[PDB]
Structures are given as structure tokens and as C-alpha cells.
């Protein structure tokens, strides 16, 4: 599970950097399938601080 | 400020010289005072804004370098520089320690001026040339 989470956290942080530069759709692209991936493994709550930050970045 | 160390309440002495008791045990904060804040002659101007009674504000000059000297004979205002404090008639110990008070003489760039504001209360040195 640490393997799946490390890339997930890596993919969550990378989209965060994209959202700061104005690329909302591609960042929304990353946030989407990470949401697909964490839902069926029960890792949504584990990444709760990061999903909260990402949507705040896109909502700007 | 309102500090009990600088209490401005009444004396405990009658005009006859006799002593009287204390009607109130504590020192009221409304009757409190504060330490002096008159500026000292320094290489740059430093101003401090202080919150006072009623949520008001008072401008304090912690360190004074320029004076708004005004020439009566010419009707012009100059923001001249200050070189030394010539003499303080209220107390020489202000001039002896380079502390500017109202009525003090200052040897400014334009000449001499008499300080015409209360630099601990106004926060600026308004001066009139002699």
C-alpha cells in the first residue's frame, strides 16, 4: 500500500504545482483519476489533506 | 500610557501640611501616567505610534534627526537637519543628554531655532528660527 500511496502522493503534489501555474484542466485531469484510484483502495481519507489543498488550488 | 509607577492622582497632604488617610486603596488606571518619551538626537528619525485611552493614538518620536524649521522673516518652511542642542531652559539635563523638549534651542543647519512643539506628544519637531 505504501507503493500505491507514494505515487499517489507524488501524483497529487505534481498536479498541485500545475494548478499554481494556471493549468487547471490538466491539474483537474490528474486530480480526477487519483480520485478514481484512492476510492476503491480506501486511501481517500489518507490523502485528505492533499485533496483538500488541490481543490482549493483549482477553485482559485 | 497609564502606568501606576507614574501615578498622577492627588497627594496625601492637606494645605495645612497635615497628613490625610487614603480613601482608595488601589491606584486607578484612569489616573495612571507614563514615562517621558521626548526624542533623543539621532542619525535617523524613528516614530512610534502608541494606543492610548479610548482607543486613540499618539505619535512618539523615539529618535530625532530633522526639524521642520520655519523662517518668520521669509515665511518659508525648511526640513533642516539638527546638529546639537544648544540649551534647555526648563532643565539643562535635557540638553546634557541630547533630549529635545519644547522651548529648547537647537543649532540647526539654517541656524538656531526654539522648539515650538511637544516632541513627546506631537511626535515632530516644529521649530522657529531665532
Amino acid at each position: 500500500l505504501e507503493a500505491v500511496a507514494a505515487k499517489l502522493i507524488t501524483r497529487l503534489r505534481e498536479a498541485e504545482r500545475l494548478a499554481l501555474e494556471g493549468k487547471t484542466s490538466e491539474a483537474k485531469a490528474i486530480l480526477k483519476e487519483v480520485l478514481k484510484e484512492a476510492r476503491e483502495r480506501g486511501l481517500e481519507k489518507s490523502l485528505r489533506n492533499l485533496l483538500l489543498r488541490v481543490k482549493a488550488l483549482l477553485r482559485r | 500610557m497609564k502606568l501606576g509607577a507614574f501615578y498622577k492622582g492627588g497627594d496625601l497632604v492637606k494645605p495645612s501640611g497635615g497628613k490625610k488617610g487614603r480613601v482608595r486603596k488601589t491606584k486607578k488606571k484612569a489616573l495612571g501616567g507614563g514615562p517621558p518619551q521626548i526624542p533623543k538626537l539621532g542619525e535617523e528619525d524613528i516614530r512610534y505610534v502608541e494606543r492610548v485611552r479610548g482607543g486613540n493614538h499618539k505619535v512618539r518620536l523615539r529618535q530625532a534627526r530633522y526639524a521642520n524649521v520655519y523662517i518668520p522673516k521669509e515665511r518659508r518652511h525648511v526640513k533642516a537637519k539638527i546638529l546639537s542642542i544648544v540649551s534647555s531652559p526648563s532643565n539643562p539635563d535635557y540638553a546634557r543628554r541630547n533630549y529635545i523638549v519644547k522651548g529648547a534651542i537647537i543649532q540647526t543647519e539654517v541656524g538656531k531655532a526654539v522648539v515650538t512643539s511637544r516632541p513627546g506628544q506631537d511626535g515632530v519637531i516644529n521649530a522657529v528660527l531665532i
Binding site: L1, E2, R13 | -
Partner: protein, 140 residues
Amino acid sequence: PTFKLVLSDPLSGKARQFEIKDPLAQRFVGLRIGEEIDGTVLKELIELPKGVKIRITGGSGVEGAPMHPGVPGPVKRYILADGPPGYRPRKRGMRKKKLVRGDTITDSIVQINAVLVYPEGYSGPPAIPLGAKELEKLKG
């Protein structure tokens, strides 16, 4: 001296709790708050990629007192606290006398707070991608 290290990963938001002992224990004593020690010291406890230096962020003593960065040296002290670091005021302007400890570590500290400092430009995976209790609860 036995320790309960709190190693937190900024890039994953998780913390791993290591218990330092004899060989590394003197590597921590004498260090001030904010210090830089290379992550290879914890190689036998944790794997850290070679761009990370774990940073010293604070800790607590044997009696629960926290270490104060604004107090220097390894000493116990009483302060008239008025702010967050070592005090949580309940009313505005309220100042309280609180017991704290210096930022320089010593034998009486039981909790030591350290955080990983990833290298510049690093974008690899998280050194602590999950919590131990969280992972154990997740598996259960």
C-alpha cells in the same frame, strides 16, 4: 538516553515515530533547534533518499514541558508566556507563567520533533507515504 523521535514528512503529511537509543543518542545531544543532520544516520531505522537532511523542530521533556526556540541553551526556565510556542491563551492579551525548556537537546527530553528536508528540485515519492497506525487500521 531513550528517545521517542517524531519524524514527519512534509511531502506526505505523515509522521513516523522512531525510538533513538545508545549509538545515535549522542548524535542528537547538543544540537539546537533547526539543525541539519544527514538522513543516513537513520539508515538502520528508515530509508531516506540522498537529498534529505532531517531538521530539528522541537520536542518535549520528561515532565511534558516543550522546548522553546526563543530560549537558548539546555536549561529549564519559567517564562511569562503570551503566545503560541509553549502556551495556548484562552483570552485576548492574557499572559501566563509557563515552564519551558531550552532549544539545546539533553538527556531529559523524551520527545524529539524532526522533519525531513527534501533536496531542492526533488520530486520523487514520499519518504513516509503512510502512517503505521493508519496502515494497520487500513489493513484491518
